[PDB]
């Protein structure tokens, strides 16, 4: 079934993040490029979270071809799709009205992306960073509404 | 087999009800709504019941589309489908005279819903709130007829 | 082994009886409806026995169905799936020379059907119901010819 | 293999008897049934034995149909395959001159086959029921020529 | 693989003897059979041995069909297994220069076998049975050359 | 997605390395050889190590063939694949703006490659040798920048 | 991946020797050979070892048809192997320049290939037997370069 | 735990009747047989079934011994082994007034037993033995006092 | 320790209630009669929940024997807890002040026995018996001190 | 348990026959070797089987011992056992009024055995020979007095 | 082992908390209750996590007993073992200068009983209270030095 | 029982071939002749074969010590085990008149040992050498009777 | 042994470090702990590895009873666990002239302890920090000659 999705140039995410999925996301990625450089493209999410070190995996590939991408969140959305979310084009990143986000996070490598992550999240949006870390450690489930507030999204349908 | 089913626009939902069906039915959903708008499709149900974070995962997407959707229910429809069953068009929700429904049933949103959920069903309904209370936390089975004057629903062959 | 019974429709029912089956035979009984209005169906049977829901479950499903259906027995033909025979049509059921048929049987509801279901296959011929309760309660293999009396069977080859 | 091997009307049966596969080789020979009603075909045997249910389940249904069976045996063939190969039509039934064909073999039915079963090989030849009872309670191996005098068997090669 | 392989009317026999396999082999004879008898078969052959209910469950079918049979040896000729190496046509059982052969081997009639199986194995050479007895309850390997003596082969590239 | 990617001239290489997946790509590598040996290829990678002997294995197949290849890493890159980073042409290898690397790991065998391969790395970056054992044994992840001075990589977007 | 490799005269073995694969090969040799006998065949080698049944089980194939036979070594290559390599024709025996080989490793008929297996492989190459001998109980891995002195091959790219 | 238990001269019997615990059941009775004529002893009960052949294994054991045995039941007193609640004396056969109990069940013996056992109660309990017959083969629970009126039980508590 | 369990004669009984379990209780009771039925007695609890069936094995027990029992509650009782909460001397049934509880729950069968408890807590409450079923059938979980002015309870600590 | 069985000079036997098992029996006879070979046993048996090999390792055991043995048979004796019911003294083989028992079963040898037990029984019942392989060859079940008119029994009760 | 440590009164608690392990604890406690008031027990820890609900299980029953408690800690010190840890005297609990002390985490009632735990430790810590609140849920190991000033730890070593 | 096995110097080995006995031996070989090497220790078998390579770890067992043995048979004296039949005094070698002995069967020393063997009974039977190579590479059983003429067996019973 | 290993006051530690070892070794130190604080105690290794958290969790405990502790080593002292070779008395830590000794390795938290171990050897060994931190951090298999000079021991046997 999830073959006959592709053939519209969408996708989807909700099981859970490893590295093997984490390769197969990039590969759907990639061919879909070689087919057509324009035709734009959009993505799902439904996730309970995930690693660290795939989340720039994607964000990378995400900033790099022809075309643009637009994305989609439904009902729960964790640390890691939260970041894929704000991710596409700043008009192009709907959710919907029941639906939770929520924040929250070999040792010298780490510390520089913790850092690097929250450089991008908080200038999408304006938000500083005093904002960010007492708000990035805790845990409270925000909703639709006040996320817009808080810069993740812009227009819920 | 299914292959042959989606020619002609119908779905199945008769096992129970996690995360990975879940992530099924929506794909599903999304299918067919690029296939066509002018295509109101139906849904057959046998359930035993399901979680809660799911529920309103799809009733989130029932309402958008361009699409209606009818729904039937056979033999036990439990707490889960049943709001699903009231959630169709108003005048597309039928079933069968051997049907029994019921209905009944992270810690700081989960109360937040069985409130949420309660405020729909008095719309659908009618009927007034408190009159839920003390029905949903019991258990009583109800049947085709003696269900249908809550107005769960609106026909029957 | 499949693809060319359901050209000549036709179905099997062998094996045991479970939800699992039971959402099965509902599509394939689905499968011809929308196929065509017109295409008297068949159905071969030999049966262990089987729970109490998916009884009545079908039974239902055949009369929504209006274009006909027929039945045979083979063998041992156990408590409900037997059920099934003679809810046919009353002179397309038939059975073979050699073949048993044999009859006997979340608390509230239960009690109801074990009377739904005499209520039903008493009135088939026009039995009384105490006549009933000294048969269904006990064991007692009949066959062929001796079990057409109770009513059960319209001819045979 | 088996589609090829069954396009030209030809059936295996070599491993062993249980009610699953019961239920298949009723429906090969229902399969060819509606597919032409007079393409006489043949049966292929290497058997250890079986139940005792299921013999009279293939036996009735050979009989029902319009077309006519044939019968070989290879090497061994215990009793309940030797039921079948003396059941075909009288002048089809082959063996090879290697094959060990000897027959050694709730409670209110069980009796009755055996008695049931027990009609049909002496009313097959014209033996008696005692010389039937004398060695069908014990095993002796018989062979291919010494058993065509019992009536089993009319050709050979 | 396999599709190719019966395609030239060529098969093999690999790995070990049980009843599953033996079931297979005569099915491909008799699937080749239903084609042109004019198709001239050849075998190849590398086995460890087997049992003996198979052995003579095969030269009688060998022997039976209007097309002739080659047979051709690899590696190491086990019992039974080269049993059927001089069961071919007298004037086309080949073999390789590195090729060993061995040809040592319910409780009244498997005794019979033995005798059976000698009588052929010496009346296809003229070799009497002094040479068996002598030389079939023991364990002695011959090679390719010496093995030609005996008979079993008639030529070699 | 293979047949689906690998028809556009794209390879991948995700999990980790044994010997079963080194004679997968060998094998990639050869199929793409004949059609068309005038289109350059590509190579992605995302690796956590691997062993010693297949890395010898590709990087001489790499030059024995007449087409090109170019490279890019993604994220983490591990002390094989960076060999095989530095394996393809000169400004025809890439990778991104997130990424890191790093570098370090039947007697004598083993021994010499280990000079072999620091043999090649160090002939390719304008660096001497002691340079490199110090940095091999050591464990220090390194950049994108500082990767580019130490002769690894260049032309990055 | 197999299909459209093997086309184009083409094999490999790459994990290991039992007898499974062995039968495997012998067929994928007789597949090419019966389908097109003027097919300049090649073959890939990289193996740990094996046994010593099959080595002659092959070799003695290997010059059987009319086609002719090229060998190549990548890496490592085994005892098993190493007599492979030097099957084919004198001219068409190559190698890589990172690779290696080793020339190392019921009863009276095992003791015999121990012996026929050098005498091939001297009169091969030229060498005496016993210096031939003298180093096959003797492991010492061994290069491409100095492998040329034995005879083993004829020529590296 | 019980190395003390059958010191007491006390046993309990709790899970199922086959074949393994019959044989340890007994063990239990006669190493105190060998150690008093005199010493009286008890028997608890708590049965979920029972089977048949192993039923005529106990009141055969029960009978012949010096010591004299009483019994006493406890809730559901499934089948076979409730015969032996009437085992003992006419009055050493207690109950509890929360207790229910049931009584229900080749082929030349079992058909003979079941009808020797209802010569058993051709000797306890509610004599009309044609009655005995009339009760068995039908499904209905009772309770102590309920019970009472037969004779299986003499003095409750 | 479980050995100077009981010689300290006290038990625990914290895991759940099956069949298994319950045999394992009886013994205990009674053993300590065994050694002296005049001692009181103590008995422990921290259930998660509970069955139904057995839940009548225990109770009676309670009442059959000459000592008397003490019950003392911790953490979480469930349906049946409560029952046996309710059971043994009067003024020595103690708890905690954090011990939540809670009191919930063939077909000729079970539907009697539910009955038998609501005729029961209202004599040992001292309470109404329409107002037990009332909470009985619902889900809300009664602190220690609200049960108190209940009635289960009356010397807390 | 077994061990204050074997100091009470009593055995048991009731589960199967096997190479396992009877490596134990010979040692509990013999155990009573080191012990005075005075002090009579006894020997209780209930066996659903038998094998054939095992048999002749026992029955000689008997007769080398000086101790003397009696035997007392339970329920079912399989065959093979059994035989040993006859095994002791023509007055010390007693039986109990509702145990059944019956009786049935390299090439070389295994023939020649049950000629050897056919052999004995004359000795022991007096009755003739050829009667005995005409009613041990077949099967058909025999009471206590049933055998009492033989000689396998002697003192009943 | 352990059965040694109860004679020198002591426990360890060191892998997790989960049902199983809560009920040897309580078991382990009270034993040593009457065998000495002044017993006071020591208690060591290291705990990588923990449960919620059945913490409160253990601080009930430690401050229940008529004996006294003196707690240490090892380095990892979970949510729960925190509570845990400060239950005992004002100047009974000490740790060691090497360790990490952490703090961290049914709808009416779960989300309860935090409260009851923020509730307290500012009785035992003497700081407030909703500061408590505000630092519990979010992470940052604090050490043995920093964690005095609270009042979690009344000496040191 | 296992140590009153050694207790009065007896053994068993009855099921197959294992390196362990010399470990049960050596206590009492050195511990008895510490103690009387001349009192009388036994040995005993029951077995279906063994190996060839463990059958030298005890000959020479029973020869370094002082202590004497004998040596008893039972039933299959499988293989090599046997030499050990005819490895004591030569006048304390038993058996029984129902036992179907037998005698049967790198590569530099096991071609040696074969030979080794058949160099030794001709010293302990007296026969010749070269007989014995014609008789043991055969296969044909011997009974007592037939053994004792040889020398193996010195007083039967 | 293991009870007589503790006794005199001897431990082994050989397998591995990780949580569940690491709570018997604290609790064999303290069995012992208990007796005397004045009887020495010996420790003896042999370690392939060590983990990291679980080695800061016994340092401290060896500082902090009043007793004693010498060390001995044996050949692979891993990483971590080692530490413990330098973790007693100034003048007890004896080694072998065979042994081969190494040195080696929350985010905010872990990078505290590599760098506190590296605060302590210099005060347990003597020399400066940077040497200790460099030949700590490559692999540098050292000898029991060359690593006495870094001052981990002073006496050898």
């Known amino acids: 079934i999830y073959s006959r999705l592709l053939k519209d140039r969408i996708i989807m995410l909700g099981s859970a993040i490893d590295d093997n999925v984490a390769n197969s996301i990039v590969s759907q990625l990639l061919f879909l490029a070689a087919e057509d450089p324009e035709k734009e493209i959009s993505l799902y999410i439904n996730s309970p979270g995930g690693s660290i070190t795939a989340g720039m995996a994607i964000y990378d590939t995400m900033q790099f ?17 939260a970041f894929l979310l ?19 996070q070999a040792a010298k490598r780490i510390l520089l992306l913790r850092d690097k992550l ?3 999240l908080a200038e999408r949006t ?3 960073l005093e904002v960010i870390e007492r708000d990035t ?3 409270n ?7 817009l507030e808080y810069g993740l999204i812009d227009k819920i349908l």
């Open 65 to 81: 071809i022809k075309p643009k991408v637009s994305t989609i969140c439904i009902g729960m959305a964790a640390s890691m799709g």
């Open 86 to 104: 704000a991710a596409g084009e700043k008009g192009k990143r709907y959710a919907l009205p029941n639906s939770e986000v929520m924040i929250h």
């Open 118 to 120: 929250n450089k991008v």
């Open 126 to 128: 304006g938000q500083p």
């Open 137 to 139: 450690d805790r845990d």
């Open 141 to 147: 489930f925000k909703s639709a509404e006040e996320a």
